[PDB]
RNA sequence: CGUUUUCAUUAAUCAAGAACGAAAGUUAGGGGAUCGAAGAUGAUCAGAUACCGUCGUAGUCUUAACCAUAAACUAUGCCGACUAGGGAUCGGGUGGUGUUUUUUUAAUGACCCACUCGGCACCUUACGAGAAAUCAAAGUCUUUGGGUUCUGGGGGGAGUAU
């Protein structure tokens, strides 16, 4: 896939893993 | 090493100045040409004709040093020099190539135009560039009638001339033929106006 | 080219080069003594003066500065020394 | 590798040129890159001038013209105008015709 | 190239360019050798007797062979003009 | 019968040129292989490689064979010819011909004692072809040739006894390696060592002394 | 298309190059000359070669055709490039510039002079 | 000089620079990170003895379509489960 | 900036010798260029040279004769012990029979042969062959 | 650039550190014509969450403050030296019993010719380099050393996890 749409998808992954990890601080 | 009498005679200077051999090329000027003499205003660079005559006697000394007269190749593709090299080939041995050079004539033998010379004289080092490029593959000295803007790569001894011409080209070929016919020749003393007419070498008609 | 005298260059080839790029570098500028015909005494003005050099007695003008050489102000008489 | 030494076009010494719009598709292309041709044409075509200069007071009066400079993009100039595609050795030429 | 007892080995001491003193190789086919006729009194030049030079391929390919032949022919005496040292 | 053209072949065939120092001195171009089959008849050949090269054709492939051949006797001359032909025997024959046209001489010298009968290179030398750089270092007596097998055979046919070799680049390509080494052994007669500093009087070409015996009828 | 091959054209060229007299402009007589002096293995190819020889006769007889010389063309051009008109200095003196005068004064001797004053 | 210092008092830049660039070597990295003692199911040792749990048939991917006869082994010194190939025509009749 | 002046001098000499010239005007002209060129003159690699004195660092015009293949600078003047001369001369000379590794010792600027004869060592400057 | 002014090594490159940094984006006012992520619609299409058409929010603009990324590209660190032929051009200067502007000769400006530094570039070659494309630098390198900074080491995993 196009490298900036993998880059955008990765930022959407990191924005989720920052959210689930924030529920358990 | 000139004995007494290879000097530029005043009649030869009148010939060379009448046929405009000194009116060289314009502001375009290769750095490998110190044969210039004090550029005339409105462009034209006057060529030192004394230097021209000295290089001419030197070239005729080189041409009259080949053991055989026929492994010298006179080259002209330009139509101003075709009759010139043809009458040069008439008087001396000096095989002509007037017009199309037919590459392969020097390198890589078995073609029908296979000349294998020890000297190549070229009327114009730009329009005869393939002969000059091809003579440097097979170890041949190249003489060239050069104007001041003409390239000097792969030419040794050059004659500073005006190859815009219609008068200077046939004259410088005529002077080479006359001078190589004086050296080792059936010819005459100091004065010796050489009954063979000067203008047999010239472009005819249009 | 390939053989030349780099120690005795011709003067015409040397009068055209930059003043730093000659064989020994030296200024192409000079001085000149000026007299304004109103006064009597002479004064020594640089060729590339950069100041409004006025005459010694009558302070009027002798040269207005410019980009390069100074301009002598049209009623003058100058000698390069 | 590099397909042109002057990469798209004609920017050496700037860093940024202000873009114009293509006249066909309105794609915004830099002004030095674009493709630029000045259309200089009469307001009458070569058939109409006879019947128009018949139909006029003030005899023939001007033949007045029309001038506009067309900036194309690389796509829409190839799609019609100045295209064909030149060979690697005929690419380096810059004489118009 | 010699050895312990005097003897020349290394076949073919090469030629050297008269304008640069560089070795003219065997695979140097732009190199050239120019024979200039010696001229006696009132012309009629002395056949089989030359002043010869050799010019490498690099001197010719750079465009320097004309000024090199002006220099090399002047200070043998074939020319008393064209080449001037202070350029 | 040979019946040559290219006048040097006639000076060779009439016997007026006897050794290839007369050709290698005057830098004469050799166009016919019989010029060196007569002036160097004890020359031995060696086919170094045969590989298939191929061309894509609108229906199928066109496979012709490329042969790398080294000739050279044992006494200071080598040649290296590379030829593709449609058939391997014709490719080897033509590679022998091109290797015979390209015979180069070799300046071999000493490691550093002036003792009898030179064994090694006079200088450090280097040849590049493609990406392969082949560097030859002079070596003491009895070193052998410290080289790859193809370079070792090219330097063996040269007559070099002791040499050291370094190499850089993709030396697995045999053509560029052999050609880099062929440059590295042809460049030994270009290095101006100080025993060659003494001036020589520039001899006349054999094409002028025997001008009569050239220039056929 | 009536484009004639290189067989017809090269044989026609070679027939004119050595038989320019004998080879008139009529097809029906060149048809018999190509029967006499050449050996052509067909009648159709004979007629084609004869027609092209007649054609090249028709355009030789209004000036030269590039490529073909037989005897008479080269004899004429041989006796044409020997020319009279010569040139001179007979029409006055040698007109020069200022700088050509400086040149001849710097090297040579007293030659006739007429300086000019051309500028930019 | 193209990329590196050269002056005589510059050996510290050269030392620290090569010491930094050594980490891009795979061998140096795996020798100075101790991959052998923590990862790599042996101890970094050569051979290791273990106990057969079950027999597996591993299908060869892509080419060489066959069933390579392997066993699943639990190592004694680690307890690490490890698949190990049993090489020859037969020899799964010898392991049990 | 100009960090070495010998390096500029020897690269000028190398380019003019590669290109077939017979003359080099060197911009920088130190004492060490004078002694380096004096050794190159002693072993025949250059002709005469002439120090032109402006009231500044000075210039030199060197005459060339074609015998020079390469002259080069070793840019950090590495401290050479007398056992390391054979290491240098094996490294950067074409053969053991010619070419000189030039080095500045407290007994002067000299080639490695005179350095072996006088039994002196020091720092390396360059090499000529 | 000019300079026969001054000081006299004050310099070169740079971990750490600092200033500036397109667009989008963020915070708070102002502004909001145009275009216009989102959104809503009309067709197309097998479907059309798209291309094409219409409308339009944030945005586009500005003030105060963030952000610190771009194919931020010449995908070419910076300083210095040398090596090649050409003609254009921009800025400065020098020369011309040169053109133009008449007032009557001038004077300036513009131009022309020649030279000169300093730029943005270009053209032809290749001595040279290169794996080649190509390169007056990507040359002056196995004949390897002018000074210095940063970066890389098979492809992924991954600029991911921590």
CSV table of C-alpha atoms (C1' of nucleotides) in Angstrom, one decimal, chain J:
chain,number,residue,atom,x,y,z
J,1,C,C1',32.6,46.0,-6.6
J,2,G,C1',36.0,50.1,-5.8
J,3,U,C1',40.1,51.3,-2.4
J,4,U,C1',48.3,52.9,-2.1
J,5,U,C1',42.0,53.2,4.6
J,6,U,C1',42.4,50.4,9.2
J,7,C,C1',43.4,46.1,12.8
J,8,A,C1',47.0,42.3,12.4
J,9,U,C1',45.6,35.7,12.7
J,10,U,C1',41.3,37.9,15.1
J,11,A,C1',40.3,32.1,11.2
J,12,A,C1',37.8,26.8,9.0
J,13,U,C1',34.4,23.1,10.5
J,14,C,C1',31.5,22.0,14.4
J,15,A,C1',28.8,17.3,19.8
J,16,A,C1',25.9,20.1,23.4
J,17,G,C1',23.0,24.6,22.8
J,18,A,C1',20.3,28.7,20.1
J,19,A,C1',17.5,31.8,16.3
J,20,C,C1',14.4,31.2,11.7
J,21,G,C1',11.4,27.3,9.4
J,22,A,C1',6.1,26.3,3.2
J,23,A,C1',1.5,23.9,3.8
J,24,A,C1',-1.8,21.6,7.0
J,25,G,C1',-3.0,21.8,12.1
J,26,U,C1',-4.0,24.1,17.4
J,27,U,C1',-5.5,28.4,21.1
J,28,A,C1',-8.2,33.5,21.5
J,29,G,C1',-10.1,37.9,19.0
J,30,G,C1',-11.0,40.2,14.0
J,31,G,C1',-12.4,39.1,9.1
J,32,G,C1',-15.1,35.8,6.2
J,33,A,C1',-15.3,38.0,-1.2
J,34,U,C1',-13.3,33.5,-3.6
J,35,C,C1',-12.0,28.4,-3.5
J,36,G,C1',-13.1,24.6,-0.3
J,37,A,C1',-10.9,18.6,3.9
J,38,A,C1',-15.9,17.2,6.4
J,39,G,C1',-20.9,17.1,5.2
J,40,A,C1',-25.5,17.2,2.0
J,41,U,C1',-26.9,16.3,-2.7
J,42,G,C1',-27.3,14.9,-9.0
J,43,A,C1',-25.6,11.6,-12.2
J,44,U,C1',-22.1,7.6,-13.5
J,45,C,C1',-21.3,2.5,-12.2
J,46,A,C1',-22.5,-4.4,-11.2
J,47,G,C1',-21.7,-1.4,-6.6
J,48,A,C1',-19.3,4.5,-6.4
J,49,U,C1',-18.8,5.9,0.9
J,50,A,C1',-14.7,8.2,-6.0
J,51,C,C1',-13.4,10.8,-10.3
J,52,C,C1',-17.5,14.9,-13.1
J,53,G,C1',-22.0,18.8,-11.3
J,54,U,C1',-24.3,21.9,-7.4
J,55,C,C1',-24.4,23.8,-2.3
J,56,G,C1',-21.1,24.5,1.8
J,57,U,C1',-18.6,24.0,7.5
J,58,A,C1',-13.6,24.2,9.5
J,59,G,C1',-9.9,26.2,6.7
J,60,U,C1',-8.1,29.9,3.3
J,61,C,C1',-6.8,36.2,5.4
J,62,U,C1',-5.0,38.8,9.8
J,63,U,C1',-3.3,39.9,15.2
J,64,A,C1',-1.0,37.5,19.8
J,65,A,C1',1.0,32.5,20.9
J,66,C,C1',1.9,27.4,19.6
J,67,C,C1',3.6,23.3,16.2
J,68,A,C1',8.7,22.1,14.0
J,69,U,C1',7.4,18.7,9.9
J,70,A,C1',7.8,18.5,3.4
J,71,A,C1',10.2,14.7,-2.7
J,72,A,C1',12.3,21.3,3.3
J,73,C,C1',15.4,18.3,-3.8
J,74,U,C1',20.4,20.3,-6.7
J,75,A,C1',17.4,13.5,-3.6
J,76,U,C1',24.6,16.3,-4.4
J,77,G,C1',27.6,19.2,3.8
J,78,C,C1',30.9,23.4,4.6
J,79,C,C1',35.9,25.9,3.8
J,80,G,C1',40.5,26.0,0.5
J,81,A,C1',43.7,24.8,-4.0
J,82,C,C1',44.5,23.1,-9.0
J,83,U,C1',42.8,21.1,-13.7
J,84,A,C1',39.1,23.1,-20.5
J,85,G,C1',37.3,25.2,-24.8
J,86,G,C1',33.1,28.7,-25.7
J,87,G,C1',29.4,32.5,-26.0
J,88,A,C1',25.4,34.6,-23.7
J,89,U,C1',23.4,37.2,-19.0
J,90,C,C1',22.9,40.0,-14.0
J,91,G,C1',25.6,43.6,-10.4
J,92,G,C1',30.3,46.7,-9.8
J,93,G,C1',34.7,48.9,-11.9
J,94,U,C1',38.6,50.5,-15.9
J,95,G,C1',39.6,51.8,-20.9
J,96,G,C1',37.6,54.1,-26.1
J,97,U,C1',40.7,61.3,-30.8
J,98,G,C1',33.1,54.7,-30.5
J,99,U,C1',27.1,55.6,-31.6
J,100,U,C1',22.8,58.1,-29.6
J,101,U,C1',20.0,62.3,-27.0
J,102,U,C1',21.7,69.6,-29.7
J,103,U,C1',22.0,74.2,-27.4
J,104,U,C1',26.5,75.3,-30.5
J,105,U,C1',30.6,72.2,-28.6
J,106,A,C1',29.5,70.0,-24.7
J,107,A,C1',27.6,67.1,-19.8
J,108,U,C1',25.0,62.8,-18.1
J,109,G,C1',21.9,58.4,-19.1
J,110,A,C1',21.1,54.4,-22.7
J,111,C,C1',24.0,51.5,-26.0
J,112,C,C1',28.6,49.4,-28.7
J,113,C,C1',33.6,47.2,-28.3
J,114,A,C1',37.6,45.2,-25.1
J,115,C,C1',38.9,43.7,-20.2
J,116,U,C1',37.9,42.7,-15.3
J,117,C,C1',36.2,40.8,-10.5
J,118,G,C1',31.5,38.5,-8.2
J,119,G,C1',26.8,35.8,-9.3
J,120,C,C1',22.4,32.4,-11.5
J,121,A,C1',23.2,29.3,-15.3
J,122,C,C1',24.1,27.1,-20.1
J,123,C,C1',26.8,24.7,-24.5
J,124,U,C1',30.7,21.3,-26.7
J,125,U,C1',34.3,17.7,-25.3
J,126,A,C1',36.9,14.4,-22.0
J,127,C,C1',42.1,14.7,-20.0
J,128,G,C1',39.6,12.4,-15.6
J,129,A,C1',35.6,9.8,-12.9
J,130,G,C1',31.7,6.3,-12.7
J,131,A,C1',27.9,0.2,-12.1
J,132,A,C1',25.8,3.0,-15.7
J,133,A,C1',22.5,7.1,-16.3
J,134,U,C1',25.6,10.8,-16.3
J,135,C,C1',29.3,14.4,-14.0
J,136,A,C1',34.0,21.2,-14.8
J,137,A,C1',32.4,18.2,-10.6
J,138,A,C1',30.0,13.3,-9.1
J,139,G,C1',37.7,15.3,-11.5
J,140,U,C1',42.6,16.0,-9.1
J,141,C,C1',41.5,7.7,-5.5
J,142,U,C1',44.7,0.7,-5.2
J,143,U,C1',49.9,6.3,-8.4
J,144,U,C1',44.6,5.4,-2.3
J,145,G,C1',46.3,11.3,3.1
J,146,G,C1',44.2,19.6,2.2
J,147,G,C1',41.0,20.7,7.0
J,148,U,C1',36.4,19.3,9.2
J,149,U,C1',31.0,17.8,10.6
J,150,C,C1',27.0,14.2,10.0
J,151,U,C1',25.1,9.5,8.3
J,152,G,C1',24.9,4.2,6.4
J,153,G,C1',26.1,-1.5,6.7
J,154,G,C1',21.0,-7.5,3.0
J,155,G,C1',15.4,-7.2,2.8
J,156,G,C1',11.6,-7.1,6.5
J,157,G,C1',9.8,-6.7,11.4
J,158,A,C1',9.9,-0.9,11.9
J,159,G,C1',10.6,4.5,12.6
J,160,U,C1',7.0,-0.5,15.4
J,161,A,C1',7.2,-1.5,21.1
J,162,U,C1',9.2,0.5,25.4
